[PDB]
Amino acid sequence: MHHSSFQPNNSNFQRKAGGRLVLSTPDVERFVILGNYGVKVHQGEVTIAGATLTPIDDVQWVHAPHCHALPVLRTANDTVIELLPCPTAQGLRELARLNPLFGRLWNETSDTFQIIYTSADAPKRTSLRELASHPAWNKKISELLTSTRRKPSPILFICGPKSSGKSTFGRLLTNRLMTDRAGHKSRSWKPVMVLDLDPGQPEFSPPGVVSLTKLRRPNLAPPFCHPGLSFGNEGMTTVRMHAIASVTPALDPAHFIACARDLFAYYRRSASQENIPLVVNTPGWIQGTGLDLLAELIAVLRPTEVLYMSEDGPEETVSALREACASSSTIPFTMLPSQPSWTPATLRSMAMQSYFHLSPFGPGCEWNPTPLTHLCPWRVRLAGRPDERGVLGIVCYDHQYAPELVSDAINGMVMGLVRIEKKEALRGLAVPGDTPLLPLIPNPTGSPLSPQYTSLVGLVLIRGVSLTASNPELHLLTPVPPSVLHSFRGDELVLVAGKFDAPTWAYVEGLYWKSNSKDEVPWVEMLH
Amino acid sequence: MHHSSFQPNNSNFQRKAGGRLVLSTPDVERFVILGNYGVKVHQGEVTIAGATLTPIDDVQWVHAPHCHALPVLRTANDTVIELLPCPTAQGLRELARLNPLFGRLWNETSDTFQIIYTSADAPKRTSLRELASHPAWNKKISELLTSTRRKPSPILFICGPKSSGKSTFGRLLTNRLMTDRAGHKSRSWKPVMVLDLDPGQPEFSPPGVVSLTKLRRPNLAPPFCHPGLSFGNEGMTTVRMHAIASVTPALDPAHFIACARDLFAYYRRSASQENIPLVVNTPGWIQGTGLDLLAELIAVLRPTEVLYMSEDGPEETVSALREACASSSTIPFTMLPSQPSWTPATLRSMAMQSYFHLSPFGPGCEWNPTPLTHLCPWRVRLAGRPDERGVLGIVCYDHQYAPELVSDAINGMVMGLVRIEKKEALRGLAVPGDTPLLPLIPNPTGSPLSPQYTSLVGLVLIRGVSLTASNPELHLLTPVPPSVLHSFRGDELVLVAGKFDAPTWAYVEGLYWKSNSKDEVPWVEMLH
Amino acid sequence: MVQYIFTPWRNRAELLAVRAQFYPEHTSFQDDEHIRSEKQKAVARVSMWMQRGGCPHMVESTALLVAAILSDEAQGSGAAGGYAVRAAYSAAFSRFVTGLLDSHQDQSMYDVAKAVGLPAAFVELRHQATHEQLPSLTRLRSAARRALEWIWWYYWKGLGPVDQSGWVLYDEKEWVPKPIGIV
Amino acid sequence: MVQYIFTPWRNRAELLAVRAQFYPEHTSFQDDEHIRSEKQKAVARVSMWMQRGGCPHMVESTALLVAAILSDEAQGSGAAGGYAVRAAYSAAFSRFVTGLLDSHQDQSMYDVAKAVGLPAAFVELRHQATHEQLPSLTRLRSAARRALEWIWWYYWKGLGPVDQSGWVLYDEKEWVPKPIGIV
C-alpha cells in the first residue's frame, strides 16, 4: 500500500478486488506492466506508449509481450486507474504447447499481468528492456502534429536501415496523431491509415504480403498478436492486400512498384472525403537496387515529409535521398537518432504460425490451441470444368516446373488464394478447361499476375494431394472463415505458389503437443 | 697511363695497339668492361664472373650486355691482360634496325668495348648495375667444390621464388665447377652438363622448350646471345630438347614430369662413363600446383644437395621441401640470401626474336640482319601421301579446333617440328593418308605426344598458307640449317601448334626497317 | 528436443534412390540411353529441392556437375556449340569450390584448401575461370570427372551402406489425425 | 612509333563482318534458321581469336552471352535440360561483370559500378550467382538481353559507322618481299 522500488517507480493503494486493481496516484508516476491487461482511466490523465486517455475513453486492451519493449505507462497528477484482466489472452497462452518459442514470452507467475519492480519480478532470462524515446524524437513529433492542424491531410514517409528502430517511431507517430485530441472537444479520434510495404517484418498482415490498414484504436500490441485483422465498431479493418510471395522485394521490382501504385490509388479515393492522414514505412535496403526502389517510391507517393532514422547512415544513401526528394518540387527531408535476442527469422516465423491458428471469430481476436494436424481440412475437387471444380488452377512465380515434380513441390508449402476480379488478368495464359493431372497453368514469362485485377484473400497451407485415379482433390486448411470461402463460385479463384519460406514449424507441432501434454512424419528427420 | 676513378678501380699502362689493349697491373684491381670483348691471360691470374684463367687458356669471348649485371673482372698481383675486339658482334649490333628494344643494349660509343669509370662513360638511362655476390654464397660454393673432389659426381638442385636470383647463383656455380683446376695439373676443365626445366625464362634454348645442354667453356653471356646452340671443338652442344608449348608448366603436369624423366635418363647413360656433374634449375612456383611438382621432381632426380635461394620464404614451401627432401633417405637442404627495368615478358620476347635471326653457320655464332619478310621461305607440299608430302600433319595441344578455323588459326603463329623416332607415338590417332584440306590429325584426349618417342628439331614460324585449289602448300621460314631438314624423309615429321605467345614482333619488324634506314600489314592496326 | 533437422526429401528412401541414379557404377546401346534418362530425372528433382529450401551444399554441387556432363554428351542439333559447354563447367566449378572454401573458414585460400583435403588444382582452376580466361574443354572434362569421385568419398558414401460444390468440409465422422503430407 | 596496337583479326573488314552477324537487327522460318547459323559461326570465330591472344575484353563477353542464348533456344534432344542453361548464363554474367569492375579500379563494388554507368542489377545478380544460389531462368534471360543492348551502346557502335621433293627452297628469281601473312 506504499510500494517502492528502483526501476519503474513508486505507487500507492493497491486494492485487490475480484481480479482487478484500482490504483490511485497523487503524483507523477511511471509503471511498467508485463502481461495482458486493460486500461480505463477513471479520473485524470494517462499516457500509454503514444496515446492519451481521459475520462471519455472506452477500455483499451494492451498486450505487453516480453519480447519487444514493454509499453511504459505514465500518470499525471491526481489520477485513478483501474486495471482489468484480459480474458481472450487465456487461449493464446496454451499456444506454448505447440512450440517452445511461445512459452517464454509472458509472465511466469500465476495471474495474467504483473507490475514490475527493480528486478524481483520479471524472472531470469533477462534483458527486460524498456520502451524509451530520445527527447529529439518527441520534439519532432510535436512539430509535425502542430503543422498538420493548420493544413490538410499529410502523408508521412518513414524509412531507414534495418534495426535503426523505424518500427518504434512508427508506433509512436501513429498513436499520437490519432489520440492527440488537444484543442477541440477532444475531436475524439481521427481515423488513421497505415501502409505497409515491408515484406520482411510486416505489420497488420502475415509475412509475404503488402497491405493498407485502417485503424480506429491506439495500436498497442506487437505484430504477432493481430496479424490477421478481420476481412470485410470494426476496430481494425483491412482494405486491400497483395501477395508478393517472397521475403525481399528483390525478385520483381516492377511488380512491387505496381502494387504500391494500386494501394495508393485506393487511399486517394477514400481520403478525398474525410481527412485521414497516412503513415507508410518502407523496407530496409540502403544500397544498390533497394536505393533505386526508394527513389521511385518517393517519386510516386510524393510524400509531404521524409524522415530518415539514422543520422549516421552511409553518404551514398543520404545523397541519393536528398536528390530524389529535392526533385519533387520540394520535400522536407530530415534525420534523427536511432538507438541501434530475437533475430528477424524467428520473429517472422512466429507471425506466420500465429496467423494460421487464428480462430474464425471489445476484445481483440481469439486463438485456437488445437494442432493443425487434428483440424479437419477443406476438400477441393480437381476434376470438372471452370464452373464445377473449385480452384481454377495453380500458377507459379519466378520459376517454372516440370509437370511430374509439381505434385511433390506444392505439397507442404504455403500458397495464396488470389481472387480474379476482371477477366483482364489471365489474358495471355492457356487456362485449362474440361480436362487426371493437376490443372497447372503454364506461365512462361514468370511475372506475377498484375496487381490491377487481382486481390489476396488470405494464405492457405496444403496438407495433402491425393490424385488416386478417380476423385482428384486437394486437402487444404485455411484460417479464412467459411462465409467468404463459400461466397466465391469457382472460376475466379486461383492459387499462387511462390517462396514464402517453407512452414517448417507445422510438421513438428503435432509431436510437441503429444509429448508435452503427456512414426514417419514426412520432412522431419529425428536424430537417434 | 695512370687512370683513376671511383667505381671500378685504378689501372695503368693502356697501350692502344691495332685495336687491342695490353694492360698490366702490378696489384689487385677490379675492372668493369661493357661491350663485346675477348680475354686471354698472358702472365698471372684473372677471375671472371666465376672462372679462373691462367697462361694455359685459350681465348674467351665475353658479351656484357647492359641489360643484366656487367661481368666483373678481378686481377691478382702482377698480371698482363690482352683485351681483343670481338668481330661477329658487329652483325648483332645491326639488329637494332629491326626492333628499338635492341638499340639501347650496348655501348653508345665508337668502338666495341669500353672500360667504365665512376659515371663518365656508361651514359644516361642509368642503372649500370654490377654483378655482386654475398660472402655467404662464396663460402657455400667453396664447401660444395671441396666435397665433390673427395666423392663421385653429384647432382645439384637449385630452386626458389622468382627474382630471388637463382640465375646468377647458377652461373657462378657452373663456372666454378668447370674452371676450378685447383690441385692437379690444372685437370684442365671437366665438362659440365646443365638441365633447364624452366619454360619461363630458359637458358640454352628458346622459350617454351626444356633441354639438356653440355658445356666445355665458361658460360659468359646472357640467355639472348646463344639461345640456339648447334644441333649435332664443339664448344656448346645440345643433347636433347622437348616442346612443352606454353610459358608455364601449368597446362599438363603429367607430360612435364615425363619429360624430366627422359632427360634424366640420357644424363644417366652418358654420365656413367666420364665424371660429369649436373646443375639443374627448376621453374618459379612456390605455392599450390608448382609446390607439388617440385616435391615430385626431388623424388625422381634424387638430388644430392638442394639449395633454396630465399632465407625468408613462406613457411609452407620450406616445410614441404624439408619433408619431401628428408624422405629420400637423407638430402642436405640449405637456405641462402637472395638480393631481390626489364620485365620477364620483354626479355622472353627478345630471346625468341634472336633465335629466329640466328644465322645458318673460336667465335660464337653469327646473326643475320635481314628482316624476316625478305628471307625466302620453305615451300612444303600439302597434297600427296605419307611418302611424297612433307609434313605428316598438324597436331593440336590442349585445345581442339573446327576444321575451317584452323587455316586462320595456324597462320602467323609459331610451331615446333617434332621428329617421330619410333612408330609407337602416333598410336591411337587417325593419321590421314592418300587424301584439298590441311591434313589435320584429330586428337581428342589433348595430351601432347609422349616424350619417349618424339624429339624437337627447332621451332618454325609460318608466314603464309595458300591452298589455291591445286597445289596445297605452306610457306614457312626456320633457322634450322638446310642439311638436317633435307636429311628427313617426310613420314617422320609433324608440326605441333600450341600457345607459344604469338610472335607479335615479327610483323612490325618489316616496317621499322623501312623507316629507320630511310599498306595493310595483317594483324597490325596503325592508329591515325 | 533440438534433435530436429529439416530436409526437403520426403523421407530417406528417396534420397538413396537419387544417389543410385547419380552413380550407376558404384551403386550396382539401349542400356546407355536408359542411364542417360535416369540422370536427367535426378537433375530435375534436385532443382525442385533447391527451391523448396534447405538443401545440403554438396548435393547442389553434384547436380550441377552432372548437368554439364550430360550437355556435353549430346549428339544432335542441340550440342551447345562448343563455347557453352565450357561455360556450364566453369559455373559448376566456381559454385562448388566457393562453397567448400567459404564454409570451412574462421589464412589464405591454399591453406584452407589443404586443410579440407581438396586438391589444389581445383582452387587454381576456379581462379583462372573467374578472372581471366575460360579454360580449355579437355582440362575441364577431366577435372569434372575427378571432382565427382572425390565428392563420392567425402559425402555420398556416408549416407548409408552399399547394397457451389467446390469446397466441402471433410466429414467430422470419418477423418483421422495424420502427419502433414500423407493422405 | 608506339602507335602500334596488335590485334588478332587479320584486318578491319573481318571485325565489322563479325559485328554484322552478332546483331542482325541494328546492322541492317527459313530466314530464322539462316540467322541462327551465322550466329554460331561468329561464336566459333571469337573462340579462335581468344586463343590467338590479345582480344578486347568486351568482345569475349559478348561471345559468351550469345553462346548461352543459342543453347537456350534449341529444340530437339539437345536442349540442356533446364539446369545447364542457367549455368551458362551465370558463367557469362560473372566473367563480364568481373572484367568491367576489375579493370576500372584504383571504393566499393557499387560505387565503381555507378561510376562506369553499369546498372546495379548486374552486380547484384553476379554476387547472388557465385555465393549462394543460381538465379531463376526467367531473370537470367531478361538480364542477358538487356546486357547485350548495353554493350552495344558502350562498345560495338563505336567501331565504325552503320551502313625427297618434300621441301623446296622458293626460287630466288621469282620471290618478292611481302607482308607476313599474305601469299
Short mmCIF file of N, CA and C in Angstrom, two decimals, chain A residues 246-327:
data_model
loop_
_atom_site.label_atom_id
_atom_site.label_comp_id
_atom_site.label_asym_id
_atom_site.label_seq_id
_atom_site.Cartn_x
_atom_site.Cartn_y
_atom_site.Cartn_z
N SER A 246 7.51 -13.47 -51.44
CA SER A 246 8.93 -13.55 -51.13
C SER A 246 9.12 -12.87 -49.80
N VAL A 247 10.35 -12.88 -49.31
CA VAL A 247 10.69 -12.14 -48.11
C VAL A 247 11.62 -10.98 -48.42
N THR A 248 11.68 -10.57 -49.67
CA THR A 248 12.53 -9.47 -50.11
C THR A 248 12.03 -8.98 -51.46
N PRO A 249 11.71 -7.72 -51.58
CA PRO A 249 11.21 -7.20 -52.85
C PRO A 249 12.19 -7.36 -54.00
N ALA A 250 13.28 -8.09 -53.79
CA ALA A 250 14.31 -8.21 -54.81
C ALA A 250 14.12 -9.44 -55.68
N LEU A 251 12.91 -9.63 -56.18
CA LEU A 251 12.65 -10.71 -57.11
C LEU A 251 11.75 -10.29 -58.25
N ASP A 252 11.33 -9.02 -58.30
CA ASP A 252 10.49 -8.48 -59.36
C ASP A 252 10.13 -7.04 -58.99
N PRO A 253 11.09 -6.12 -58.99
CA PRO A 253 10.77 -4.74 -58.63
C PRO A 253 9.60 -4.13 -59.37
N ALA A 254 9.45 -4.42 -60.66
CA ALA A 254 8.34 -3.84 -61.41
C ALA A 254 7.02 -4.12 -60.71
N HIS A 255 6.76 -5.39 -60.43
CA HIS A 255 5.54 -5.79 -59.74
C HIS A 255 5.37 -5.02 -58.44
N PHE A 256 6.41 -5.01 -57.62
CA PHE A 256 6.39 -4.32 -56.34
C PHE A 256 5.90 -2.88 -56.45
N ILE A 257 6.48 -2.11 -57.37
CA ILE A 257 6.04 -0.73 -57.53
C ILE A 257 4.60 -0.68 -58.00
N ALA A 258 4.24 -1.54 -58.96
CA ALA A 258 2.85 -1.56 -59.41
C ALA A 258 1.91 -1.72 -58.22
N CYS A 259 2.26 -2.61 -57.30
CA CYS A 259 1.45 -2.80 -56.10
C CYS A 259 1.32 -1.50 -55.33
N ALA A 260 2.46 -0.88 -55.01
CA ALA A 260 2.43 0.40 -54.31
C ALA A 260 1.48 1.37 -54.98
N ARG A 261 1.47 1.40 -56.31
CA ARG A 261 0.58 2.31 -57.03
C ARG A 261 -0.88 2.02 -56.75
N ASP A 262 -1.32 0.79 -56.98
CA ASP A 262 -2.73 0.46 -56.75
C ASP A 262 -3.16 0.80 -55.33
N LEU A 263 -2.37 0.39 -54.33
CA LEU A 263 -2.72 0.69 -52.95
C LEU A 263 -2.92 2.18 -52.75
N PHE A 264 -1.94 2.98 -53.18
CA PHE A 264 -2.08 4.42 -53.06
C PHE A 264 -3.38 4.88 -53.69
N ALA A 265 -3.68 4.37 -54.89
CA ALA A 265 -4.92 4.73 -55.57
C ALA A 265 -6.11 4.67 -54.62
N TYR A 266 -6.35 3.51 -54.01
CA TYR A 266 -7.48 3.41 -53.09
C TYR A 266 -7.40 4.47 -52.01
N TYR A 267 -6.23 4.62 -51.39
CA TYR A 267 -6.11 5.64 -50.35
C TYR A 267 -6.56 7.00 -50.87
N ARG A 268 -6.16 7.33 -52.09
CA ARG A 268 -6.55 8.60 -52.69
C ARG A 268 -8.06 8.76 -52.70
N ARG A 269 -8.74 7.76 -53.25
CA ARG A 269 -10.20 7.81 -53.35
C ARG A 269 -10.87 7.99 -52.00
N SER A 270 -10.52 7.16 -51.02
CA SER A 270 -11.16 7.26 -49.71
C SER A 270 -10.81 8.57 -49.01
N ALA A 271 -9.52 8.85 -48.88
CA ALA A 271 -9.07 10.04 -48.17
C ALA A 271 -9.75 11.31 -48.65
N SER A 272 -9.90 11.46 -49.97
CA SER A 272 -10.50 12.65 -50.53
C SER A 272 -11.68 13.20 -49.73
N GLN A 273 -12.50 12.33 -49.15
CA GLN A 273 -13.66 12.80 -48.39
C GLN A 273 -13.33 13.25 -46.97
N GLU A 274 -13.02 12.31 -46.07
CA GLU A 274 -12.75 12.60 -44.66
C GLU A 274 -11.26 12.63 -44.34
N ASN A 275 -10.76 13.80 -43.92
CA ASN A 275 -9.35 13.99 -43.58
C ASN A 275 -8.73 12.85 -42.79
N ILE A 276 -7.99 11.98 -43.46
CA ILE A 276 -7.33 10.86 -42.80
C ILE A 276 -5.85 10.79 -43.17
N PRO A 277 -4.94 11.11 -42.26
CA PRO A 277 -3.52 11.03 -42.57
C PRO A 277 -3.06 9.61 -42.83
N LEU A 278 -1.90 9.49 -43.48
CA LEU A 278 -1.31 8.21 -43.86
C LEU A 278 0.12 8.08 -43.34
N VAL A 279 0.45 6.92 -42.77
CA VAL A 279 1.80 6.63 -42.29
C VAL A 279 2.32 5.42 -43.03
N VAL A 280 3.37 5.60 -43.83
CA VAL A 280 3.95 4.50 -44.59
C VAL A 280 5.38 4.24 -44.15
N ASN A 281 5.73 2.97 -44.00
CA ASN A 281 7.09 2.57 -43.69
C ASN A 281 7.54 1.63 -44.80
N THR A 282 8.72 1.86 -45.31
CA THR A 282 9.31 1.14 -46.42
C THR A 282 10.21 0.02 -45.95
N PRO A 283 10.74 -0.82 -46.89
CA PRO A 283 11.61 -1.94 -46.50
C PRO A 283 12.85 -1.58 -45.71
N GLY A 284 13.95 -2.25 -45.99
CA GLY A 284 15.13 -1.97 -45.21
C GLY A 284 16.42 -1.96 -45.99
N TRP A 285 16.33 -1.63 -47.27
CA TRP A 285 17.54 -1.54 -48.07
C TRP A 285 18.06 -0.11 -48.04
N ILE A 286 19.36 0.01 -48.28
CA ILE A 286 20.03 1.30 -48.27
C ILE A 286 21.13 1.31 -49.32
N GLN A 287 21.23 0.25 -50.11
CA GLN A 287 22.26 0.20 -51.13
C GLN A 287 21.77 -0.57 -52.34
N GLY A 288 22.37 -0.26 -53.48
CA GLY A 288 22.02 -0.90 -54.74
C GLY A 288 20.55 -0.79 -55.05
N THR A 289 20.02 -1.85 -55.65
CA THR A 289 18.63 -1.98 -56.05
C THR A 289 17.69 -1.23 -55.12
N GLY A 290 17.63 -1.66 -53.87
CA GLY A 290 16.73 -1.04 -52.91
C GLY A 290 16.75 0.47 -52.96
N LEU A 291 17.95 1.06 -52.95
CA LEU A 291 18.05 2.51 -53.03
C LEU A 291 17.27 3.04 -54.21
N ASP A 292 17.33 2.34 -55.34
CA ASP A 292 16.59 2.76 -56.51
C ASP A 292 15.09 2.69 -56.24
N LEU A 293 14.65 1.57 -55.65
CA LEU A 293 13.24 1.44 -55.30
C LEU A 293 12.78 2.62 -54.47
N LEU A 294 13.52 2.93 -53.41
CA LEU A 294 13.15 4.04 -52.54
C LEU A 294 12.98 5.32 -53.34
N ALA A 295 13.96 5.64 -54.18
CA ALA A 295 13.83 6.84 -55.01
C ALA A 295 12.52 6.82 -55.77
N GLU A 296 12.23 5.70 -56.43
CA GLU A 296 10.99 5.57 -57.19
C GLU A 296 9.76 5.79 -56.31
N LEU A 297 9.67 5.07 -55.19
CA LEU A 297 8.54 5.24 -54.29
C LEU A 297 8.34 6.69 -53.91
N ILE A 298 9.43 7.38 -53.56
CA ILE A 298 9.31 8.79 -53.20
C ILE A 298 8.69 9.57 -54.34
N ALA A 299 9.08 9.25 -55.56
CA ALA A 299 8.50 9.93 -56.71
C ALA A 299 7.01 9.66 -56.85
N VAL A 300 6.59 8.40 -56.73
CA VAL A 300 5.18 8.05 -56.94
C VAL A 300 4.28 8.58 -55.83
N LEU A 301 4.65 8.37 -54.57
CA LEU A 301 3.80 8.82 -53.47
C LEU A 301 3.78 10.34 -53.31
N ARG A 302 4.89 10.99 -53.54
CA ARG A 302 5.01 12.43 -53.34
C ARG A 302 4.76 12.71 -51.87
N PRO A 303 5.60 12.16 -51.00
CA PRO A 303 5.44 12.37 -49.57
C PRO A 303 5.63 13.82 -49.17
N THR A 304 4.82 14.27 -48.22
CA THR A 304 4.98 15.62 -47.70
C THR A 304 6.24 15.74 -46.86
N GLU A 305 6.54 14.75 -46.02
CA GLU A 305 7.74 14.79 -45.19
C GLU A 305 8.43 13.44 -45.14
N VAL A 306 9.74 13.44 -45.37
CA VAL A 306 10.55 12.22 -45.36
C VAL A 306 11.44 12.22 -44.12
N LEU A 307 11.35 11.16 -43.33
CA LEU A 307 12.12 11.04 -42.09
C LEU A 307 13.07 9.85 -42.17
N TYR A 308 14.36 10.13 -42.14
CA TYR A 308 15.41 9.11 -42.23
C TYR A 308 15.92 8.84 -40.81
N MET A 309 15.67 7.64 -40.30
CA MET A 309 16.08 7.30 -38.93
C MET A 309 17.52 6.82 -38.74
N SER A 310 18.55 7.50 -39.24
CA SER A 310 19.91 7.03 -38.99
C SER A 310 20.81 8.07 -38.34
N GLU A 311 20.96 9.25 -38.95
CA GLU A 311 21.83 10.34 -38.50
C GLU A 311 23.31 9.97 -38.63
N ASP A 312 23.60 8.75 -39.04
CA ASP A 312 24.99 8.41 -39.34
C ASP A 312 25.09 7.51 -40.56
N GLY A 313 24.04 7.44 -41.37
CA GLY A 313 23.98 6.50 -42.46
C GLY A 313 25.02 6.78 -43.51
N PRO A 314 25.25 5.82 -44.39
CA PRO A 314 26.27 5.99 -45.42
C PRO A 314 26.00 7.23 -46.26
N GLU A 315 27.08 7.79 -46.82
CA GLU A 315 26.91 9.02 -47.58
C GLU A 315 26.12 8.78 -48.85
N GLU A 316 26.25 7.60 -49.45
CA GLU A 316 25.56 7.31 -50.70
C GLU A 316 24.05 7.45 -50.54
N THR A 317 23.48 6.73 -49.57
CA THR A 317 22.04 6.77 -49.38
C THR A 317 21.55 8.18 -49.10
N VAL A 318 22.18 8.90 -48.17
CA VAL A 318 21.72 10.24 -47.86
C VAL A 318 21.73 11.11 -49.11
N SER A 319 22.83 11.08 -49.85
CA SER A 319 22.91 11.89 -51.06
C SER A 319 21.78 11.56 -52.04
N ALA A 320 21.59 10.27 -52.32
CA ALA A 320 20.53 9.87 -53.24
C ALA A 320 19.17 10.34 -52.76
N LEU A 321 18.87 10.09 -51.49
CA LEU A 321 17.59 10.53 -50.95
C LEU A 321 17.41 12.02 -51.12
N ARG A 322 18.41 12.81 -50.73
CA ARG A 322 18.27 14.25 -50.87
C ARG A 322 17.96 14.64 -52.30
N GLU A 323 18.70 14.08 -53.26
CA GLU A 323 18.43 14.39 -54.67
C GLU A 323 16.98 14.11 -55.04
N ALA A 324 16.59 12.83 -54.97
CA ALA A 324 15.23 12.42 -55.34
C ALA A 324 14.19 13.25 -54.62
N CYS A 325 14.40 13.47 -53.33
CA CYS A 325 13.47 14.25 -52.52
C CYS A 325 13.36 15.67 -53.05
N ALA A 326 14.50 16.33 -53.24
CA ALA A 326 14.54 17.68 -53.77
C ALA A 326 13.80 17.81 -55.10
N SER A 327 13.88 16.77 -55.94
CA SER A 327 13.26 16.83 -57.27
C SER A 327 11.75 17.06 -57.24
#
